[PDB]
């Protein structure tokens, strides 16, 4: 994995040693070249994973999350060029440094073969993420957002640290490959109940689980555009990736310990979807959409079937491109009107004809229109949960209705109707804005043709 | 607030329309419209102001009980089948300041002519502001409608959007 | 209780501006000032060939429009599909599955020469 780690580190010298007026050009160009080379990780075999060394490996679960990660960095640099326009050069090159350092921790996190190496980099992503939110947020609530985003994660991460070390002293190794052959069943005792929670609550908070989600509406809303894109596109999937790995060593206790977290997800799925029907902030509405969508991933991971895992992986990748796209679309409006209220600028389809097409395509994937990978992932989870309990179709069907209501309501409150009269600064769509959306949707739509590469290790 | 005169006049306007919807046929509308017209004439000479109100509160109630459950609506009114059907075509006029020169040159007469109106507004605005502030109570304005042009040359204050509103049938 | 003197004056003043503004919304004969558009020689032939009415020849012209359409939209796509079906789809098992034909008594099988005996005598009647 050094072939991707070293180039990522060399972007930092590139930014600092580049011309004062070429920081964006050089970083964007060379970050796209790193993304292009990540396609070599798809050399996957049907029996064994691609094991590079004692430290790093990449299987069919890590590969799609790596390509989305390295592909997201170029798109975050395009989105940041506007609000970082009157910023002094040194701080602009520090902002890019934080983004690069975040990618470096992420790709190593998704390939760490050792679960304690996974933990360190897993926690290492908080530092740059916190710095981006609090130093380059526009509102006074960004300072409070960082505290919520920091202490919610650490409140659950520290118990995970103890549990991981306890496992090593018992099994003898936290290397993932070894655990696949040395895993022993978990007895039903009170000690193992809290070992289960410690190993899982660190990831429930990041997914996030309903009830433990109050940090997301504060962090995703106060963060700059680049922070929101990575926050909702990759950093939420850090929790999902964690469960898919650590649930290996929690059987058969996951059969009953998952009930409280399936009801929070199945019901919290409906609640957060309902919240989006009455949100007065466009960015906040998208934040609550991630909570509703990630509720499916928790259910799929906790029922442990070949179809649930296939759906969860496609859902995590599908939501990553969609959620990032929606934040970018919402920011283009903000860059003009400079206000997050959803009912302030209406009828935008009359002033920005092309940007309205992106809104439609973004909304359709959000509501899982087939054959998009948004539907493929959601459909597979629905098939698996039906076999888990036939009554769940009621809850996951009601969520479909609500998801279509708030997604098209978002598309109708901003793009249709009557244009606001007193807003006269809605300039045409820049090439930067249009190209930013095309990069989100084209790969999202292209994956439909060959979707087996995002179906995970159980394909 | 409406005047007692207007309320009777309104209830007469509604009654014929709702009456028309029931009748459909024009010949039967005249035979019944006159009778309704006749009934207003009975108390048209009323000058009590306490029994005229009493009948009016029974006139509206009589209308409500027998109102049509689906009155005819002209197909461009608040409830018709083509209300706001062309609001998607009513682009503002300030959007042309953002046009590209490669496409602004497509209409050399139009945009040369536009600068006249912007000058006619940019120079006129200060006069329009002055006129409004000097014809208003010290506390502040008390109603709608604005003073018209007093002298020559000056245009009515707050005229740009009223004059330049998008054409009701853009395309 | 119609218009107060001010209101009529304002409406006429606005109506003088409004109807001048709408008069501005007309295009001179030159407008739009289109760029120099190239005309293909194939277009030149038909423009000069049609010109006058000549209803007799317009039958052929539609055939030319249809001859091209039947070529690029029917003949080319069917060539691709037949080539695709005959050499990539049909070369794999059960990609195309045909419901076996309905055989009847008193017929000969084109492939093996087998003959199916006709049905028994019919105890039928009239009407």
């Amino acid at each position: 994995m050094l072939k991707y780690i070293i180039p990522t580190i060399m972007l930092m010298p590139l930014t600092w040693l580049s011309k004062n007026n070429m920081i964006w050009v050089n970083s964007t160009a060379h970050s796209l070249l790193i993304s292009f080379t990540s396609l070599l990780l798809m050399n996957q075999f049907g029996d064994n994973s691609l094991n590079f060394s004692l430290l790093f490996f990449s299987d069919s679960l890590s590969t799609p999350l790596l390509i989305l990660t390295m592909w997201l960095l170029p798109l975050m640099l395009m989105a940041s060029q506007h609000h970082l326009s009157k910023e002094n050069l040194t701080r602009k090159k520090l902002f890019i440094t934080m983004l690069i350092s975040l990618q470096l921790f992420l790709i190593m996190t998704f390939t760490a073969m050792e679960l304690i190496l996974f933990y360190i980099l897993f926690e290492a992503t908080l530092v740059p993420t916190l710095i981006i939110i609090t130093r380059w947020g526009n509102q006074t609530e960004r300072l409070n957002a960082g505290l919520y985003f920091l202490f919610y994660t650490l409140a659950g991460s520290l118990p995970l640290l103890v549990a991981l070390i306890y496992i090593q002293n018992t099994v003898g190794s936290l290397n993932f490959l070894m655990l696949q052959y040395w895993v022993q069943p978990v007895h039903n005792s009170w000690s193992n109940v809290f070992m289960w929670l410690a190993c899982m609550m660190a990831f429930m908070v990041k997914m996030p689980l309903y009830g433990l989600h109050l940090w997301l509406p504060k962090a995703h809303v106060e963060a700059p555009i680049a922070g929101s894109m990575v926050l909702a596109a990759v950093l939420l999937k850090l929790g999902g990736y964690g469960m898919l790995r650590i649930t290996l060593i929690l059987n058969p206790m996951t059969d009953f310990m998952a009930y409280p977290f399936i009801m929070l997800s199945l019901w919290g799925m409906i609640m957060t979807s309902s919240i989006c029907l009455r949100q007065t902030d466009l960015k906040s509405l998208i934040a609550y959409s991630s909570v509703s969508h990630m509720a499916l991933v928790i259910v799929a991971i906790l029922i442990q079937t070949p179809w649930s895992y296939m759906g969860a992986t496609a859902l995590m990748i599908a939501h990553g491109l969609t959620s990032s796209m929606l934040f970018c679309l919402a920011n283009s409006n903000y860059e003009r009107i400079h206000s997050r209220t959803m009912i302030l600028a209406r009828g935008l389809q009359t002033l920005l004809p092309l940007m309205a097409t992106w809104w439609l395509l973004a909304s359709l994937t959000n509501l899982a229109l087939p054959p998009t990978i948004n539907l493929i992932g959601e459909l597979f989870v629905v098939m698996s949960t039906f076999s888990w309990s036939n009554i769940t179709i009621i809850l996951m069907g009601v969520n479909m209705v609500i998801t279509a209501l708030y997604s098209l309501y978002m598309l109708i409150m901003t793009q249709r109707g009557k244009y606001t009269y007193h807003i006269n600064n809605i300039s045409p769509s820049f090439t930067r804005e249009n190209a930013l959306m095309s990069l989100h949707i084209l790969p999202l739509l292209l994956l439909t043709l060959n979707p087996k590469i995002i179906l995970g290790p159980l394909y | 607030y409406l005047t007692h005169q207007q309320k009777v006049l309104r209830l007469y306007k509604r009654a014929l329309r709702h009456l028309e919807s029931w009748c459909i046929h024009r010949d039967k509308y005249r035979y019944f419209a006159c009778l309704l017209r006749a009934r207003f004439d009975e108390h048209k000479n009323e000058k009590d102001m306490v029994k005229a109100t009493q009948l009016l509160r029974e006139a509206e109630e009589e209308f409500w009980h027998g109102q049509h459950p689906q009155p005819y609506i002209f197909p461009e009114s608040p409830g018709g089948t083509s209300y706001e059907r062309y609001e998607c075509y009513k682009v503002p006029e300030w959007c042309l300041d953002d046009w590209h020169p490669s496409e602004k040159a497509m209409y050399p007469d139009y945009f040369a002519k536009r600068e006249q109106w912007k000058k006619l507004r940019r120079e006129s605005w200060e006069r329009e502001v002055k006129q409004l502030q000097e014809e208003t109570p010290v506390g502040g304005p008390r109603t709608e409608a604005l003073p018209p042009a007093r002298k020559q040359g000056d245009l009515p204050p707050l005229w740009w959007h009223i004059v330049t509103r998008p054409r009701e049938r853009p395309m | 209780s119609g218009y107060t003197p001010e209101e009529k004056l304002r409406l006429q003043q606005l109506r003088e501006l409004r109807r001048r503004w709408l008069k501005d919304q007309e295009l001179s004969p030159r407008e739009p000032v289109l760029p120099p558009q190239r005309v293909s020689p194939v277009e030149r032939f038909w423009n000069k060939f049609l010109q006058d009415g000549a209803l007799w020849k317009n039958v052929i012209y539609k055939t030319y429009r249809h001859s091209i359409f039947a070529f690029t939209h029917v003949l080319i796509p069917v060539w691709i599909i037949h080539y695709y079906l005959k050499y990539h789809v049909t070369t794999k098992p059960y990609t195309i599955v045909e419901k076996k034909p309905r055989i009847f008594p008193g017929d000969t099988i084109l492939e093996t020469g087998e003959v199916i005996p006709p049905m028994k005598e019919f105890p039928d009647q009239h009407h």
Partner: peptide, 12 residues
């Protein structure tokens, strides 16, 4: 009798 249709900039 050709009128001018006001549209948002379609060039970009």
């Amino acid at each position: 009798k050709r009128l001018f249709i006001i549209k948002p900039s379609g060039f970009y």
